[PDB]
Design a protein around this nucleic acid. Structure first.
Lengths: 85, 226
DNA sequence: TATAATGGGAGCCTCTGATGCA
DNA sequence: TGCATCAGAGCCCAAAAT
């Protein structure tokens, strides 16, 4: 029943999501370059803010414990970037 | 939205519950309507050109500019507007009204403007000589609905006026967007030459803006009311 | 690592106590 | 407040079981 609550994608809708996903990964690569920050660490901060406050936890590979204090610091560092970045 | 059916509301427009989005589609909630996948992008390109006309002095109303639809002249009797240069005719017809462009070699020697009420007597690519009638003008002639006159100069020679009109209008060109393409440009956007409108997998099939213009979205795949 | 693929499957007593309706 | 309906609780011992 829960499965049945998400409508299936149109070819257009499917390509849009797939396209945005690929582009998002390319964006994470760029932010690594600009900031000199771990791409994986960047991905978890981005992912943390999208999923919401509900899920926040340490990831086995990350060197820093991932908690609202650290994700705020890094999110605030990303928002401290120039417009084109 | 049923195939081929164009939407009533435009992308970005605030919408009340019950409002009709498309001929067969009615919205269930209040909020902002959003276009999902526009199939056809219509770009109105901006053109500003200087074109001439000659009229009987008694038939024309003096103004410094003409808004679309405004009455340009009223002719007591039918008048034959004649070529003032020899050349081959490039006839470019607007929604209503026409432009006529004489060229020798490839260099344009004259650009004439035929308002509404003026029927071309020539066809595209016709050779004309000085003094032969290009267009018949009968009764009241007025500006077409889609074209303006920003500046109007008038010279008087004998019993006629020669108007040098600085005319501004938009010429539409439609582009078809395929399912694997995404529109990278917003509704009502201003694009210059080289600007990308629609993007695609490979460099060809991309839509690059040909010249200065504004962008309009039509035939969306669906409308998302949020 | 790439045609497209998009919602499952089996089924057969008595007393006591809490719970959901006149 | 008084009454059905249902879920969950029970239902001998030892021997043996090839």
């Amino acid at each position: 029943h829960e499965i049945g609550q998400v409508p299936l994608l149109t070819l257009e809708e499917e390509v849009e999501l797939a396209r945005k996903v690929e582009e998002g990964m390319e964006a994470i690569k760029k932010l690594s370059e600009i900031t000199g920050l771990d791409p994986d660490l960047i991905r978890e901060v981005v992912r943390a803010k999208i999923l919401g406050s509900a899920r926040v936890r340490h990831i086995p590979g990350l060197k820093e414990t991932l908690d609202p204090k650290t994700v705020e610091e890094i999110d605030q560092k990303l928002k401290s970037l120039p417009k084109e970045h | 939205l049923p195939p081929g059916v164009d939407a009533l509301v435009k992308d970005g427009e605030e919408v009340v519950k019950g409002q009709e989005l498309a001929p067969g589609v009615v919205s269930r909630l209040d909020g902002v309507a959003l276009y999902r996948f526009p199939r056809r992008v219509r770009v109105e390109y901006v053109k500003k050109e200087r074109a001439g006309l000659r009229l009987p002095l008694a038939a024309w109303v003096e103004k410094e500019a003409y808004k679309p639809g405004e009455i340009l002249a009223e002719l007591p009797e039918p008048y034959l507007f004649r070529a003032e240069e020899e050349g081959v005719v490039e006839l470019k017809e607007l929604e209503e009204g026409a432009f006529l462009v004489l060229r020798r070699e490839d260099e344009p020697v004259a650009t004439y403007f035929l308002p509404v009420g003026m029927t071309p007597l020539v066809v595209h690519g016709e050779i004309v000589e000085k003094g032969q009638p290009l267009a018949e003008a009968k009764g009241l002639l007025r500006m077409p609905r889609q074209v303006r006159a920003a500046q109007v100069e008038a010279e008087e020679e004998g019993e006629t006026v020669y108007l040098t009109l600085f005319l501004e209008w938009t010429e539409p060109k439609d582009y078809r967007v395929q399912p694997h393409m995404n529109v990278v440009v917003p509704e009502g956007a201003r694009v210059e030459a080289g600007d990308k409108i629609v993007a695609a997998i490979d460099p060809e099939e991309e839509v690059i803006a040909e010249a200065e213009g504004v962008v309009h979205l039509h035939e969306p795949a669906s409308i998302l009311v949020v």
